[PDB]
Structures are given as C-alpha cells and as structure tokens.
Amino acid sequence: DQLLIVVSILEGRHFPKRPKHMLVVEAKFDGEQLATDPVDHTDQPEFATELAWEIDRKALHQHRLQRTPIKLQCFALDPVTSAKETIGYIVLDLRTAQETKQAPKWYQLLSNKYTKFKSEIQISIALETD
C-alpha cells in the first residue's frame, strides 16, 4: 500500500580505466544513504543495481512540492586501503519519478574529477507500489 522510489543505475561510459580501482555510487534521499556494490573501474562500468527508498504517500507529495533532489555521489574505491575519493555527482529529481512512461537517461557527472573525460551514468527513476 506504501510506495518505493526506485533508482535504477544501469551502465556508465567515458570513464578512465583505473585497473587498481572500483566504482561505487552512493545515493542520499531524505537522510537515508544507500549504495551500490563496488564494480570494476573500466571505461564502461556496469552497475545494474536498483536503489529503493520506501516512502509515505503523504511524505512523497511534500517532497514533490519543496523539490527534494536525490543526489548520487560517485566514488573511486581503492580495494586495498578501502579509501574512497569523490569523482563527481548526479542530481535527480522526484518529478521525473512520476513519469507515466519509463525511459533511462544518460546523466553527466557534475564536478567530474576526471576533467578530460565526459563520464556519464545511465539511470532510470520510477515509483513502485509495495
């Protein structure tokens, strides 16, 4: 009876190949942080993960009104030291979560640490009941 905000993180492209590193996307919405598994830091990383927040019907509409974003942070993870370095960010908003036809979009990393690379991550956002 109560909803989920479902953020599907599919694939990246135009990343540098970093053989000793992994990629992790963490997402924050309304003070709850979620994360993907580490995936190989290739030029075309494959996340293939759904991040989901359960939300109240009432709480959802208050979030739509004040324009509450979902912020995705991308990290390069060193699997030896567990050290994470921020590489860039993606801002999603909840109004496109309420689109009757679902279609994945390419989102450029903002404040991209890899300055010469036009790194992009393909993401869908949707609402699901129960």
PDB file of C-alpha atoms in Angstrom:
ATOM      1  CA  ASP A   1       0.000   0.000   0.000  1.00  0.00           C
ATOM      2  CA  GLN A   2       3.007   2.287   0.523  1.00  0.00           C
ATOM      3  CA  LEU A   3       5.456   3.392  -2.212  1.00  0.00           C
ATOM      4  CA  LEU A   4       9.109   2.892  -3.205  1.00  0.00           C
ATOM      5  CA  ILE A   5      11.307   5.402  -5.024  1.00  0.00           C
ATOM      6  CA  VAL A   6      13.276   3.093  -7.354  1.00  0.00           C
ATOM      7  CA  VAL A   7      16.531   4.455  -8.841  1.00  0.00           C
ATOM      8  CA  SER A   8      17.967   2.003 -11.409  1.00  0.00           C
ATOM      9  CA  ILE A   9      21.675   2.590 -12.097  1.00  0.00           C
ATOM     10  CA  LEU A  10      22.481   0.717 -15.314  1.00  0.00           C
ATOM     11  CA  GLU A  11      25.817   1.491 -17.017  1.00  0.00           C
ATOM     12  CA  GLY A  12      28.487   4.220 -17.191  1.00  0.00           C
ATOM     13  CA  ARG A  13      30.614   5.338 -20.168  1.00  0.00           C
ATOM     14  CA  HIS A  14      33.620   7.669 -20.821  1.00  0.00           C
ATOM     15  CA  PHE A  15      35.323   6.797 -17.529  1.00  0.00           C
ATOM     16  CA  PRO A  16      39.110   6.400 -17.384  1.00  0.00           C
ATOM     17  CA  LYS A  17      40.264   2.789 -16.952  1.00  0.00           C
ATOM     18  CA  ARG A  18      41.754   2.553 -13.454  1.00  0.00           C
ATOM     19  CA  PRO A  19      42.949  -1.107 -13.057  1.00  0.00           C
ATOM     20  CA  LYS A  20      43.522  -0.901  -9.263  1.00  0.00           C
ATOM     21  CA  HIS A  21      40.160   0.820  -8.527  1.00  0.00           C
ATOM     22  CA  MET A  22      36.434   0.116  -8.227  1.00  0.00           C
ATOM     23  CA  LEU A  23      33.410   2.391  -8.732  1.00  0.00           C
ATOM     24  CA  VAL A  24      30.651   2.884  -6.126  1.00  0.00           C
ATOM     25  CA  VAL A  25      27.591   5.121  -6.405  1.00  0.00           C
ATOM     26  CA  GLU A  26      26.019   6.212  -3.125  1.00  0.00           C
ATOM     27  CA  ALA A  27      22.593   7.853  -3.158  1.00  0.00           C
ATOM     28  CA  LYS A  28      21.047  10.040  -0.471  1.00  0.00           C
ATOM     29  CA  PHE A  29      17.336  10.867  -0.163  1.00  0.00           C
ATOM     30  CA  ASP A  30      15.639  12.387   2.906  1.00  0.00           C
ATOM     31  CA  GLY A  31      18.577  11.492   5.197  1.00  0.00           C
ATOM     32  CA  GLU A  32      18.880   7.811   4.207  1.00  0.00           C
ATOM     33  CA  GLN A  33      22.010   6.736   2.361  1.00  0.00           C
ATOM     34  CA  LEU A  34      22.063   3.735   0.026  1.00  0.00           C
ATOM     35  CA  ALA A  35      24.945   2.309  -2.023  1.00  0.00           C
ATOM     36  CA  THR A  36      25.721   0.038  -4.942  1.00  0.00           C
ATOM     37  CA  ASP A  37      28.284  -2.755  -4.727  1.00  0.00           C
ATOM     38  CA  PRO A  38      31.814  -1.841  -5.881  1.00  0.00           C
ATOM     39  CA  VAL A  39      32.114  -2.508  -9.644  1.00  0.00           C
ATOM     40  CA  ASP A  40      35.251  -2.595 -11.824  1.00  0.00           C
ATOM     41  CA  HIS A  41      36.524   0.894 -12.810  1.00  0.00           C
ATOM     42  CA  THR A  42      36.549   0.171 -16.575  1.00  0.00           C
ATOM     43  CA  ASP A  43      35.686   2.807 -19.243  1.00  0.00           C
ATOM     44  CA  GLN A  44      32.092   1.411 -19.347  1.00  0.00           C
ATOM     45  CA  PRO A  45      31.261   0.337 -15.716  1.00  0.00           C
ATOM     46  CA  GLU A  46      28.194  -1.878 -15.206  1.00  0.00           C
ATOM     47  CA  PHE A  47      26.279  -1.082 -12.011  1.00  0.00           C
ATOM     48  CA  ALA A  48      22.966  -2.866 -12.831  1.00  0.00           C
ATOM     49  CA  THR A  49      21.536  -2.024  -9.344  1.00  0.00           C
ATOM     50  CA  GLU A  50      18.200  -0.674  -8.102  1.00  0.00           C
ATOM     51  CA  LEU A  51      18.383   1.642  -5.060  1.00  0.00           C
ATOM     52  CA  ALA A  52      14.971   1.884  -3.354  1.00  0.00           C
ATOM     53  CA  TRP A  53      13.527   4.144  -0.608  1.00  0.00           C
ATOM     54  CA  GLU A  54      10.185   3.240   0.947  1.00  0.00           C
ATOM     55  CA  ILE A  55       8.115   6.414   1.340  1.00  0.00           C
ATOM     56  CA  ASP A  56       4.706   7.548   2.667  1.00  0.00           C
ATOM     57  CA  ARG A  57       2.071   8.664   0.135  1.00  0.00           C
ATOM     58  CA  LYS A  58       1.743  11.906   2.192  1.00  0.00           C
ATOM     59  CA  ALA A  59       5.561  12.212   2.555  1.00  0.00           C
ATOM     60  CA  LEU A  60       6.045  11.829  -1.232  1.00  0.00           C
ATOM     61  CA  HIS A  61       3.836  14.823  -2.138  1.00  0.00           C
ATOM     62  CA  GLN A  62       5.562  17.082   0.435  1.00  0.00           C
ATOM     63  CA  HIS A  63       8.868  16.072  -1.225  1.00  0.00           C
ATOM     64  CA  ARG A  64       7.485  16.880  -4.705  1.00  0.00           C
ATOM     65  CA  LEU A  65       6.354  20.370  -3.539  1.00  0.00           C
ATOM     66  CA  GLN A  66       9.686  21.514  -1.962  1.00  0.00           C
ATOM     67  CA  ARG A  67      11.609  19.983  -4.959  1.00  0.00           C
ATOM     68  CA  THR A  68      13.659  17.406  -2.947  1.00  0.00           C
ATOM     69  CA  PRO A  69      16.503  16.015  -5.073  1.00  0.00           C
ATOM     70  CA  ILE A  70      18.064  12.582  -4.991  1.00  0.00           C
ATOM     71  CA  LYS A  71      21.839  13.172  -5.036  1.00  0.00           C
ATOM     72  CA  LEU A  72      24.116  10.441  -6.355  1.00  0.00           C
ATOM     73  CA  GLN A  73      27.805  10.572  -5.393  1.00  0.00           C
ATOM     74  CA  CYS A  74      30.293   8.554  -7.489  1.00  0.00           C
ATOM     75  CA  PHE A  75      33.458   7.258  -5.746  1.00  0.00           C
ATOM     76  CA  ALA A  76      36.658   5.612  -6.901  1.00  0.00           C
ATOM     77  CA  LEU A  77      37.363   2.942  -4.280  1.00  0.00           C
ATOM     78  CA  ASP A  78      40.819   1.547  -3.572  1.00  0.00           C
ATOM     79  CA  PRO A  79      40.019  -2.159  -2.644  1.00  0.00           C
ATOM     80  CA  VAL A  80      43.433  -2.473  -0.880  1.00  0.00           C
ATOM     81  CA  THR A  81      43.065   0.540   1.520  1.00  0.00           C
ATOM     82  CA  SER A  82      39.204   0.869   1.358  1.00  0.00           C
ATOM     83  CA  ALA A  83      39.869   4.600   0.723  1.00  0.00           C
ATOM     84  CA  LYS A  84      37.153   6.372  -1.305  1.00  0.00           C
ATOM     85  CA  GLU A  85      37.694   9.503  -3.442  1.00  0.00           C
ATOM     86  CA  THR A  86      34.709  11.510  -4.747  1.00  0.00           C
ATOM     87  CA  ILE A  87      34.804  11.722  -8.576  1.00  0.00           C
ATOM     88  CA  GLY A  88      31.569  13.584  -9.278  1.00  0.00           C
ATOM     89  CA  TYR A  89      27.856  13.930  -8.562  1.00  0.00           C
ATOM     90  CA  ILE A  90      24.476  13.413 -10.240  1.00  0.00           C
ATOM     91  CA  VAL A  91      21.305  15.239  -9.153  1.00  0.00           C
ATOM     92  CA  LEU A  92      17.978  13.509  -9.883  1.00  0.00           C
ATOM     93  CA  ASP A  93      14.589  14.990  -9.016  1.00  0.00           C
ATOM     94  CA  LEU A  94      11.351  13.339  -7.954  1.00  0.00           C
ATOM     95  CA  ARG A  95       9.062  14.896 -10.597  1.00  0.00           C
ATOM     96  CA  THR A  96      10.531  12.622 -13.310  1.00  0.00           C
ATOM     97  CA  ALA A  97       9.997   9.675 -10.952  1.00  0.00           C
ATOM     98  CA  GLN A  98       6.336  10.401 -11.702  1.00  0.00           C
ATOM     99  CA  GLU A  99       6.527   9.955 -15.477  1.00  0.00           C
ATOM    100  CA  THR A 100       3.948   7.541 -16.913  1.00  0.00           C
ATOM    101  CA  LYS A 101       6.423   6.203 -19.489  1.00  0.00           C
ATOM    102  CA  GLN A 102       9.752   4.966 -18.097  1.00  0.00           C
ATOM    103  CA  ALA A 103      12.953   5.609 -20.077  1.00  0.00           C
ATOM    104  CA  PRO A 104      16.639   5.556 -18.868  1.00  0.00           C
ATOM    105  CA  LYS A 105      18.639   8.788 -19.264  1.00  0.00           C
ATOM    106  CA  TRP A 106      22.351   9.480 -19.551  1.00  0.00           C
ATOM    107  CA  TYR A 107      23.479  11.818 -16.779  1.00  0.00           C
ATOM    108  CA  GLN A 108      26.820  13.619 -16.957  1.00  0.00           C
ATOM    109  CA  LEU A 109      28.819  13.563 -13.707  1.00  0.00           C
ATOM    110  CA  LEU A 110      28.975  17.117 -12.385  1.00  0.00           C
ATOM    111  CA  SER A 111      32.204  18.393 -10.819  1.00  0.00           C
ATOM    112  CA  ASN A 112      33.905  15.428 -12.528  1.00  0.00           C
ATOM    113  CA  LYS A 113      37.416  14.755 -11.071  1.00  0.00           C
ATOM    114  CA  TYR A 114      38.351  13.193 -14.445  1.00  0.00           C
ATOM    115  CA  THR A 115      38.422  16.589 -16.202  1.00  0.00           C
ATOM    116  CA  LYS A 116      39.209  15.392 -19.760  1.00  0.00           C
ATOM    117  CA  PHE A 117      36.558  12.610 -19.616  1.00  0.00           C
ATOM    118  CA  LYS A 118      32.844  13.209 -20.290  1.00  0.00           C
ATOM    119  CA  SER A 119      31.861  10.468 -17.790  1.00  0.00           C
ATOM    120  CA  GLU A 120      28.137   9.587 -17.900  1.00  0.00           C
ATOM    121  CA  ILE A 121      25.897   7.144 -15.972  1.00  0.00           C
ATOM    122  CA  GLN A 122      22.624   5.784 -17.413  1.00  0.00           C
ATOM    123  CA  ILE A 123      19.824   5.986 -14.798  1.00  0.00           C
ATOM    124  CA  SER A 124      16.046   5.347 -14.529  1.00  0.00           C
ATOM    125  CA  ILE A 125      13.920   6.741 -11.683  1.00  0.00           C
ATOM    126  CA  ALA A 126      10.408   5.367 -11.009  1.00  0.00           C
ATOM    127  CA  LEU A 127       7.724   4.907  -8.350  1.00  0.00           C
ATOM    128  CA  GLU A 128       6.580   1.401  -7.310  1.00  0.00           C
ATOM    129  CA  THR A 129       3.666   0.400  -5.068  1.00  0.00           C
ATOM    130  CA  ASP A 130       4.576  -2.089  -2.302  1.00  0.00           C
TER     131      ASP A 130
END
